[PDB]
């Protein structure tokens, strides 16, 4: 049997899948090892490997945002990768430690990301100076009965709403000597309730649709109906191909200070179930070379956390990229400790309850954290 590797890439039916297909094709051309690039939705890949991995049907290389890395490692999904110091030295510090857990490196980075204010230059000449101005802009221009919006975003999704919580001094996990305590969830603190109250206002006063999803936000912006969204670098190519003259700015200052968004790092990881860890790691290196990631940026629009590429004027001074870099500079990497794998469902459920007017900020957050704590007592080895 000739050598074959399997790779799971995001199922975007577009730029990300095509770019990975290209470079895998070049690896096969060079090495003779056949590589199949299979589209699997990025946020479904970990759950799919949870089943297919032990079943012996999993991919050799997988990819998802770094926040669930600790969870993945604890569950035995991934193995550390063996690369030279020279290969490591080519990538940004923040990205490399985000893919590092328990002193071990679990991947090589493809993209570093933060949401920012993405606006339609034909609808919005100048960005609002403050969050208060931004919210008033939404309150005046969000008219769902005529398919028109001033500001639209996934306000039912904690990934996006995080800056509202951070503004009030809320944290996902408390500052117990860095991050050395599984029981330091801060998502039902008084400050966190202040953040969730801000979320509530977007549905009660800015009349944002209930049960929002990426497709709804993106589709409406692409149709020219929305002046501004809070979204990430992943949506740029799609917006530009929909004829939008896109501007990117850091989120307007909230309570007088810089907005603190999450920073995401997406890397390639090596499955613990891989029958060919040597060859797969070689493919991972090939897919994340300077040449590979420079091409990836050109096609996908996703910012590669490669040291030389981040300072490439072609990428660094790109007006679209610049806005995202600015916002990311004020942001924090998502937690990547194992207990992050218990956070997302309850907290997003809490956003849903408040958005629907079913539970208050306080009640929703209290219920969510109780659920989180209970689930942590069913985790690990």
Ligand X SMILES: OC[C@H]1O[C@@H]2O[C@H]3[C@H](O)[C@@H](O)[C@@H](O[C@H]4[C@H](O)[C@@H](O)[C@@H](O[C@H]5[C@H](O)[C@@H](O)[C@@H](O[C@H]6[C@H](O)[C@@H](O)[C@@H](O[C@H]7[C@H](O)[C@@H](O)[C@@H](O[C@H]1[C@H](O)[C@H]2O)O[C@@H]7CO)O[C@@H]6CO)O[C@@H]5CO)O[C@@H]4CO)O[C@@H]3CO
Query: What residues make contact with ligand X under the rule CB under 6 A?
Result: 10, 41-44, 65, 67-68, 113, 157, 159, 214, 232, 234, 264, 344-345, 348
Integer CA distances (angstroms), 216 to 95, 111, 154, 220, 223, in order: 30, 24, 9, 6, 11
Is the CB of 276 or the CB of 344 nearer to ligand X? 344
Cα 81 to Cα 104: distance, rounded to the nearest angstrom: 8
Q: How far is the CB of 242 from ligand X (least distance, A)?
A: 15
Choice between 135 and 234, CB closer to ligand X = 234
With CA atoms as reference, report the closest residue to 251 among 326, 332, 347: 326
H-type alpha helices, 79-189:
85-88, 93-98, 131-141, 158-167
In order of 70, 116, 140, 211, 364, the CA distances from 223 in angstroms are 39, 20, 20, 20, 34
Q: For ligand X, which is the closer residue by CB, 43 or 129?
A: 43
Q: Judge residue 358's burial from the number of C-beta atoms within 10 Å of its C-beta, 0-12 exposed, 13-18 middle, 19 or more buried.
A: exposed
Nearer to ligand X, 82 or 356 (CB): 356
Of the pair 13, 84, the CB lying nearest ligand X is at: 13
**CB 245 → ligand X: shortest distance, Å?**
21
Least distance to ligand X, CB of residue 372, Å: 12
Q: Show Cβ contacts of residue 123 under 8 Å, excluding neighbours closer than 6 positions.
A: 224, 226, 227, 228
Phi, psi of 221 (to 5 degrees): -65, -45
Minimum CB separation of residue 262 from ligand X in Å reads 7
For residues 174 and 186, the answer to whether their CB atoms sit within 8 Å is yes
Q: In whole angstroms, how close is the CB of 187 to ligand X at the nearest point?
A: 13
CB 84, min distance to ligand X, A: 28
Q: How far is the CB of 109 from ligand X (least distance, A)?
A: 13
* CB nearer to ligand X: pick between 221 and 279: 221
Looking at the Cβ atoms of 44 and 316, the one nearer to ligand X is: 44
* Closest of 297, 81, 254 to residue 167, by C-alpha: 254
Beta bridge partners of 105: 100
């Amino acid at each position: 049997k000739p050598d074959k590797l399997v790779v799971w890439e995001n199922a975007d039916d577009g730029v990300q899948l095509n770019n990975t297909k290209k470079w895998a094709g070049e690896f096969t051309k060079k090495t003779g090892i056949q590589v199949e690039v299979v589209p699997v939705a990025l946020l479904k890949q970990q759950e799919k490997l949870t089943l297919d991995g032990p079943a012996g049907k999993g991919a050799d290389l997988v990819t998802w945002p770094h926040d669930r890395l600790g969870e993945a490692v604890t569950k035995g999904l991934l193995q550390p990768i063996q690369v030279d110091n020279s290969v490591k030295n080519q990538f940004d510090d923040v990205a490399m430690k985000a893919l590092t857990y328990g002193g071990k490196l679990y991947g090589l980075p493809k993209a570093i990301e933060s949401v920012a204010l993405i606006y339609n230059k034909k609808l919005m000449g100048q960005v609002p100076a403050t969050y208060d101005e931004l919210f008033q802009y939404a309150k005046a221009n969000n008219k769902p009965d005529e398919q028109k919006y001033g500001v639209l975003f996934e306000a039912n999704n904690f990934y996006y709403t995080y800056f509202l919580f951070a503004a009030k001094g809320a944290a996902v996990f408390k500052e117990q000597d860095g991050t050395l305590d599984p029981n330091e969830i801060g998502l039902n603190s008084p400050e966190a309730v202040q953040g969730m109250n801000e979320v509530q206002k977007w549905f009660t006063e800015a009349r944002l649709p209930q049960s929002l999803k990426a497709d709804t936000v993106n589709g409406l912006f692409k149709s020219g109906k929305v002046a501004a969204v809070i979204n990430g670098p992943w949506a740029i190519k799609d917006y530009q191909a929909a004829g939008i003259n896109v501007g990117v700015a850091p989120l307007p200052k909230i309570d007088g200070k810089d907005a603190q968004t999450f920073i995401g790092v997406k890397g390639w990881y090596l499955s613990a179930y891989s029958k060919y860890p040597k060859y797969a790691t070689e493919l991972m290196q090939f897919l994340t070379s300077k040449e590979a990631l420079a091409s990836r940026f050109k096609e996908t629009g996703e910012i590669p956390p490669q040291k030389e590429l981040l300072n490439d004027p072609m990428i660094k001074n790109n007006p679209v990229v610049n806005g995202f870099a600015k916002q990311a500079s004020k942001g924090v990497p998502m937690p990547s400790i194992p207990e992050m794998g218990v956070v997302w469902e309850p907290i997003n459920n809490a956003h849903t309850f408040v958005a629907q007017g079913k539970q208050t900020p306080e009640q929703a957050l209290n219920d969510a954290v109780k659920i989180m704590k209970e689930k942590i007592q069913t985790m690990k080895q």
